[PDB]
């Protein structure tokens, strides 16, 4: 609950960093594992994959991160730690 | 009348499948034959061709399918059967 | 139905592996047999063949894998087993 | 007027064929003669020349064919007849 | 006064043609020369440049054509004649 | 019509074989007879003749085989039979 | 103030020329020096770098030229003079 | 001004001929004298020198011919006359 | 004009024969007289003289035959008649 | 932190030089050591390795340099100093 | 698994050395044993064998080394040890 | 700086002459002294040494001359003066 909420909160706590740190591949592989574990429907997936710029593709994931809770978010947190990108 | 209505009804009966089964090319070739036989005006055609995602481009055709009746719809039914996509 | 759905699901179950395991030739020969048996229209084929990177060419096939069902997918599963690549 | 309208209408009458019959060179030489006789502005020319697939490059010309009338279209009709491609 | 009024009236006299004849580049270059000579404020310019379809972008200019009089309109008339598009 | 379509279809039916069976000379002599009978424009001919690998030069012909119909394809079928290569 | 305003005004005074005179390299080097001196944020930079045509990439810079004032614009004026392109 | 404009216009007047008449050496020597007199930046030069076919390398110069005016074009006109190729 | 065009057309009319009939010496002496009368630049000459096989050296001349018109071609026609090879 | 930031800032401070000074081998060896120490994912690596021109391949690395921080950048700074290229 | 992964990792650990140490014959014999044991398809084999420089032919193998895992890589490790080249 | 820049500029000032005046031995000895003093990496050296024609081998050096500055260029200027070739 708490650290579950903190997980997406930490995303929201450092969201400016995710605009900086997350690449397209850091995005698109993270788009993959969500679509792999089916944490996102494809209609929402097409929304992120059609935005023109990186930051436009970033924010659509990160807005969808908030509405989908912790398990959607924890893997993205795990993505940046499995990257060891440490942003 | 009846099967004429059923034709667009069958579209509405399996609309979730058309979100699944219809591609962009299954869309855009179907956009072609409607524009070929002039079953759609170009103002409505530009509406479908400008939506950002596939499903956004799907639903705009499928909403326009209902208001335009059977002959607009029967060719789209014929499109999926001329595809032999069988969705 | 079920294993038919599981076939493209197994693709979606291990999609990160297909980003890893599938080469260009593992891609392009798989593009061939689909185009050989006419499981893909050429407009969708040109979409995959024009993407700049391997992973960009990978994802376009794999997105088209989901919308086209089992027979489109089963041969790609058969491709990796006829490769005996075992990914 | 009439056959002038029929000229671009015949294009719209068989547009699926132009997706089939017209190549890249059948496209790009037709792009040339329009740009030769200045029937197209270069901003519209860059739109066609930047689309990724053939069919994407096809449709942009063919959409621009309708808005530009007969003289823009008659040479394209003459192109397919000077090709003797007879599509 | 009169031909000044007729200039935007001729636009209104053949407005259906401007939905047909005017392209995006015929639009956007005409958007340029108005913004070049500062016949439009940028807030009104952003209104036209954000509409999703061509016809949506067409009508916003053409509605703004009526409220801004002759000098705003005469250059657009001159645009179609400098195009020699003759619509 | 039918066997005319089957002729290029048989090419598409066994396209993996044409990646295997067709050599460079089996390619380039087939490029000759098409250019001899003027079934290909030289702009499309330069596209095939500039690809770096055999298979890259193979696929460009075989993609151009589909868009150009039967008479373009029947001689290539006749080429493999005049070769008596029997692939 | 005045010549500061005139600097971006001169850009707006001859904007049709910048559609003509500015190349991609005249664009992209000008995109560089702005990003070098950090006169543009990268989110706005990705907007220009993703537009499909030259003129689409031109106008996005030139629209961003107006909202960012003189120092953003003076270097672009200096760019065309350091080019000695004299447009 | 006029004959200055006519110089690049004559290029555009007979552009189909330049697709025909200009060789690679007629291209690449013309690429040299532009790069000799520094009428082209090297970023634009690399764009022409990387296109796969002759016509692809032709059109990139000829598109860059229009945006760069007369002095960029007059030497290319002088190139074909110093060639005495008379196309 | 006509027989001037027919001269290189007759080359294109029987190009398969030139793959057959023309030797290396029938090639290289024909390369000489073109270089003697300066109908070819040396950069294009080095292109033909570096291809590995006869047919590779044949096609490079014969492709250069089309872009260089009649006087470049008429001597090659005269070469085969001064040979009295009669191909 | 500071000199860590300055390291990628110095890259951004002299980015026009990196368009000049960095070769393909200065690029591709620098692409190697990043891929050697795994400072880049291969999806981002394929993006740089597929761009057509040097400068297109340059900017994709240099854009990826900013989003990946100091350790990604410090080795590239070390690359130019281990080159002793001193740009 | 681990030393299996380390085997291709050791390749990636010292990849700069493989640019140095591996010759053409150290390459091409290694290309042989992979093609002998059928660890590579011929389409991927033609990709390596067509690159112009040694390092271009090196990197294409070494990129294909990563996507094909351990057994593809272990023999290449065994190749350098059967060479006793000890790089 | 200035004469340092002029040194490679003089190369660019008379580049058509270097296409004329420089032989293969004037090339390859100049390739030697650069490789002797290690002004070129071997990956760039293999690029020049693999081009098929002299002019193809010429331009690759001369393009690499511009990106590598003065000391790379001054010895090539010294090469033509130590030749006393005086081109």
Numbering used by the authors:
A (entry chain K), B (entry chain G), C (entry chain H), D (entry chain D), E (entry chain F), F (entry chain E), ...: 430 to 516
Quote what the paper states about this structure.
After depletion of the intrinsic RIP2 in HEK293T cells, both NOD1/2 full-length and NOD1/2 CARD domains failed to activate NF-κB, which demonstrates that RIP2 is the predominant downstream signaling adapter for NOD1/2. In this study, we demonstrated that the innate immune adapter RIP2 forms a helical oligomeric structure upon activation. Loss-of-function mutations in NOD1/2 and RIP2 are associated with autoimmune diseases, such as Crohn’s disease and lupus.
We then constructed the atomic model of RIP2–CARD filament and validated it using pairwise charge-reversal mutagenesis. These findings provided a direct view of how RIP2–CARD is organized in a C1 left-handed helical filament upon activation. A 13 amino acid tag was added to the N-terminal of residue 432 of RIP2–CARD and the last 11 amino acids at the C-terminal end of RIP2–CARD were removed to stabilize the core RIP2–CARD filament and prevent filament bundling on the EM grid. As a typical Type I interface, residues from helix 1 and 4 (orange, Type Ia, R444, E445, and D492) interact with charged side chains from helix 2 and 3 (red, Type Ib, Q458, D461, Y474, and K471). In Type II interactions, residues at the turns between helix 2/3 and helix 4/5 (orange, Type IIa, D495, Q497, E472, and D467) mainly interact with residues located within the turn between helix 1/2 (green, Type IIb, N449, T452, and K513). Type III (orange and blue) interface was relatively weak and it was stabilized by interactions between residues from helix 2 (orange, Type IIIa, T479, E475, K471, and E472) and coiled turn between helix 3/4 (blue, Type IIIb, R483, T482, T484, and R488). Overall, the stability of the RIP2–CARD filament was maintained by a collection of weak charged interactions involving almost all surfaces of RIP2–CARD. Cellular activities were completely abolished when we disrupted the native interaction pairs E445–Q458 and N449–D495. When the interactions at these sites were rescued by introducing reversely charged interactions pairs, E445R–Q458E double mutant regained its activity and was six times more active than any of the single mutants.
